Amino acid sequence: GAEIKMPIDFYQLPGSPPCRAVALTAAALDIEMNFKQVNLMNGEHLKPEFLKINPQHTIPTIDDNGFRLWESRAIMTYLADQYGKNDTLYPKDLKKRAIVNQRLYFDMCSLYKSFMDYYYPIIFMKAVKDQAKYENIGTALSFLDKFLEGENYVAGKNMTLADLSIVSTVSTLEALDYDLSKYKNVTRWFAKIKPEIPKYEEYNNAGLKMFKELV
Ligand SMILES: N[C@@H](CCC(=O)N[C@@H](CS)C(=O)NCC(=O)O)C(=O)O
Structure with a gap:
């Protein structure tokens, strides 16, 4: 809204099943997201910067131009309706x-x-x-x-x-x-x-x- 749109920030870890579900959804919609790796193994999801994005400190999380959403399957249905062709x-x-x-x-x-x-x-x-x-x-x-x-x-x-x-x-x-x-x-x-x-x-x-x- 009255803002230059940016790629969706996609907070993820490649091996994670719920992150792959979201990634495959983006691919099926021809969406190019900004993949941001969150290394759970050294606690990056527990740093102040990520807790501000998602206080539940879970991945996947998306930040769509200020709209922050987690729960993989809620992300999937949001992307499908917002960007479906x-x-x-x-x-x-x-x-x-x-x-x-x-x-x-x-x-x-x-x-x-x-x-x-x-x-x-x-x-x-x-x-x-x-x-x-x-x-x-x-x-x-x-x-x-x-x-x-x-x-x-x-x-x-x-x-x-x-x-x-x-x-x-x-x-x-x-x-x-x-x-x-x-x-x-x-x-x-x-x-x-x-x-x-x-x-x-x-x-x-x-x-x-x-x-x-x-x-
Ligand atoms: N129901 C959630 C599960 C998400 C989830 O469990 N994410 C794990 C990685 S696979 C996580 O971020 N664990 C770190 C934590 O909860 O602090 C979804 O489908 O997105």
């Missing part, structure tokens, strides 16, 4: 939109949740492997496989934000040698979607390399 990535139709939203909550409350509850303690807290938490991943993947039965995408007939959200989680599971082979709809979708996602190699795999690096 088609009506397929986040449909305006309320029922189609609701299914996309449902799948984003499923990702955050079930799939990504189960992934993190199991792997993060084992890796970065030297925790003992908990079989029940491991099995919660399979439970979530079983539901994802059901959602994909007879479907090409996770939330409708075209690629949507929900595919970008969920692929950031599923590709991290693959990177950690989780056996996805029994979920045949998931593996079909996964092989199918990667060539369709703009900048998948640059924005997802290159970061996943940094992820396997640090683990």
